[PDB]
Each structure stands twice: as structure tokens, then as C-alpha cells.
Amino acid sequence: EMEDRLSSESARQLFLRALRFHPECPKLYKEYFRMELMHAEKLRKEKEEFSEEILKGELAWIIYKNSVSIIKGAEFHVSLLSIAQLFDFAKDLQKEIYDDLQALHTDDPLTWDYVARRELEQAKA
Amino acid sequence: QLVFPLEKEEPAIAPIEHVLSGWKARTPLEQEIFNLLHKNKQPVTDPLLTPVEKLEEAKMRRAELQRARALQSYYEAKARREKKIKSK
Amino acid sequence: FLNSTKAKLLKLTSSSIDPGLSIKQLGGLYINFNATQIKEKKKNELLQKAVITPDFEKNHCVPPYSESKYQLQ
């Protein structure tokens, strides 16, 4: 629907119905999260060629809170961040999710490791 | 030849876009998505792809259909360019 | 075919949507669209139902090639 027929709204219903059949599949949540961020890019370029809240990526941010609630996992929350970094727009969305990583997810080794590797990223030696 | 009953029948397989209109929202995700959409100007479903049951607001939706129809022309008009470009 | 969209021609997003399953992960498509797997299976299954068997050399007398219907009954 998206990449061929260019219909964002029809693809949304196919995703939303898919979650009711499979409420616990993380792959469905990540692809749905990615899909809305794709919808934001189409609208940003639409404005350049010629609603503010969606253009900020708020509509994808709703998915993030709900998905974290259903799937209480450290790896899944970090996974949603990876797609978020891939989209250049709305760095606050990447900032918001990253901040929640430390506060919400603690006492688990993976979260502390990710913070360490981010800091990693003759004089140059 | 005469076929009885005279009333015609809709084809066996609905092509998805007719089906997706029937679905509604019950889970908290679909509530929040729909609420944010309706407070804005963005529509839930496709006007041209999804048919509906056969005044001033109706004219605006007709105008929205024309802009939506104009958009699909633009992306198709855009696509043909690189196809000619890649052919070159 | 699996991933050849016109959105790939009109680069509008950095990424695409990835379905986990792939054509190569499966056996592949049954048909070809340019210039045989099942026929290999039929050839292999037919070969497994062969009268030439292990211990064929071990057998002292070969079973008869063909028999009348009356004798079998």
C-alpha cells in the first residue's frame, strides 16, 4: 500500500488490524513505528514543494508509549531507538526515547552498556 | 435468456479497500491514533480508493477529492521522469 | 519482485519496510520471469522407489520381471 499505491491511510488500517490478531509480536510494532515516521517524511517534502503536530512525529510517538507498555523488555525499547536515529527529522523524538532508556529501564546490563558505547562514538590516538 | 432473481449480486471477493472501511476502534492504541487524527485535518481513510454509500461540507470533500486526485497525478507525473532518465 | 517498488525509484525515505521472510529463505518462486526444484524432488522420490536396491548383488535369485494377474491373485 505504501511504497506502490502511495496510500498511507489504507496501510494504517492494515497495521492496526494486524495488532489485534497478534498483540505480542514485536516485529509488528517496529514496522508500524517505522511506517508512521515514513508518513512524516512524505508530509515534510509535501510542505516544501508548496498539521503541525503530525509533522513533528507525534503520531509515531503514541506508538512508542503503548508498545513499551505491552512489551516490557529492554531490547525492544532499544530497538525502537535504532529506527528513530535513522530518521533525521525530529531529533527530540530520539532525545525523548533515549532519556527514557536510563530512567525507565534500570537494573539491566544492556541499558548501561548502550550508554557506554555511545560515549565511545598520534594526537588522534 | 432471462436470469432470476433479477437483482444483481456483488462479486465474491472484496478488494480490501472496501473491507477496511468497516473496521472500527476498540483498543487504546486505535483510540489515541483516531483522536489525534480527527482533531487535526487528516482523514482516516482514502476518499477515492474507499467508496461510500451511494451541502457546503459536501463541496469541500469534493474539493478534497480533486486535490487527492491531483496528487496521484503528480507522483505519477514525477515517476515517469526518472523512468525516462534511467532509460537514457 | 520481492522488493522492487516505485518508491525505490522516487527516493522519499531513507529505508523501506522489511518483511522478515525472504524468497531465498523459502524454496523460492515456482515460476521465472526472464531468460526446477520440484522436478528434482519427483526425480528423487521416484528413484527411492527403485527395484535396484541395497543387497541387490547379495540376492541369489532376482525376482521375476513380470507376472500374470492370475498368479498374483
Curated annotation (Swiss-Prot), chain A:
Entry keyword set: Nucleus, Repeat, rRNA processing
Compartments (UniProt record): Nucleus, Nucleolus
HAT repeat copies, ranges: 6-38
UniProt record, GO biological process: maturation of SSU-rRNA from tricistronic rRNA transcript (SSU-rRNA, 5.8S rRNA, LSU-rRNA); ribosomal small subunit biogenesis
Record flagged with keyword ATP-binding: no
MF annotations from Gene Ontology: snoRNA binding
GO cellular component entries: chromosome; nucleolus; nucleoplasm; Pwp2p-containing subcomplex of 90S preribosome; small-subunit processome
Assembly and interaction partners: Part of the small subunit (SSU) processome, composed of more than 70 proteins and the RNA chaperone small nucleolar RNA (snoRNA) U3.
Function: Part of the small subunit (SSU) processome, first precursor of the small eukaryotic ribosomal subunit. During the assembly of the SSU processome in the nucleolus, many ribosome biogenesis factors, an RNA chaperone and ribosomal proteins associate with the nascent pre-rRNA and work in concert to generate RNA folding, modifications, rearrangements and cleavage as well as targeted degradation of pre-ribosomal RNA by the RNA exosome. Involved in nucleolar processing of pre-18S ribosomal RNA.
Similarity comment: family membership: Belongs to the UTP6 family.
Protein name: U3 small nucleolar RNA-associated protein 6 homolog
Source species: Homo sapiens (Human)
Gene that produces this protein: UTP6
Curated annotation (Swiss-Prot), chain B:
Expressed in which tissues: Ubiquitously expressed.
Superkingdom of this protein's organism: Eukaryota
Residue range from the parent sequence: 156 to 250 of 771
Post-translational modification: Citrullinated by PADI4.
Protein family membership: Belongs to the UTP14 family.
Quaternary structure and partners: Interacts with DHX37.
Misc. comment: The human genome also contains the UTP14C gene, an autosomal retrotransposed copy of this X-linked gene. Evolution of autosomal retrogenes from X-linked progenitors compensates for X-chromosome silencing during male meiosis.
Disulfide bridge map: none
Gene name tied to this protein: UTP14A
Protein name as annotated: U3 small nucleolar RNA-associated protein 14 homolog A
Biological function: May be required for ribosome biogenesis.
UniProt-annotated location(s): Nucleus, Nucleolus
Residues with PTM Phosphothreonine: 50
Swiss-Prot record, chain C:
Phosphothreonine modification, residue list: 53
Modified residues (Phosphoserine): 22
Region (TdBR region): 1-48
Location of cross-link Glycyl lysine isopeptide (Lys-Gly) (interchain with G-Cter in SUMO2): 11, 49, 69
Location in or out of the cell: Nucleus; Nucleus, Nucleolus
Tissue: Widely expressed with higher levels in testis.
Spans traversing the lipid bilayer: none
Subunit (UniProt): Forms a ternary complex with DNTT and core histone; interaction with PCNA releases DNTT and H2A/H2B histones from this ternary complex. Interacts with ESR1, ESR2, PPARG and RXRA. Part of the small subunit (SSU) processome, composed of more than 70 proteins and the RNA chaperone small nucleolar RNA (snoRNA) U3.
Function per UniProt: Regulates the transcriptional activity of DNTT and ESR1. May function as a chromatin remodeling protein. Part of the small subunit (SSU) processome, first precursor of the small eukaryotic ribosomal subunit. During the assembly of the SSU processome in the nucleolus, many ribosome biogenesis factors, an RNA chaperone and ribosomal proteins associate with the nascent pre-rRNA and work in concert to generate RNA folding, modifications, rearrangements and cleavage as well as targeted degradation of pre-ribosomal RNA by the RNA exosome.
Name assigned to this protein: Deoxynucleotidyltransferase terminal-interacting protein 2
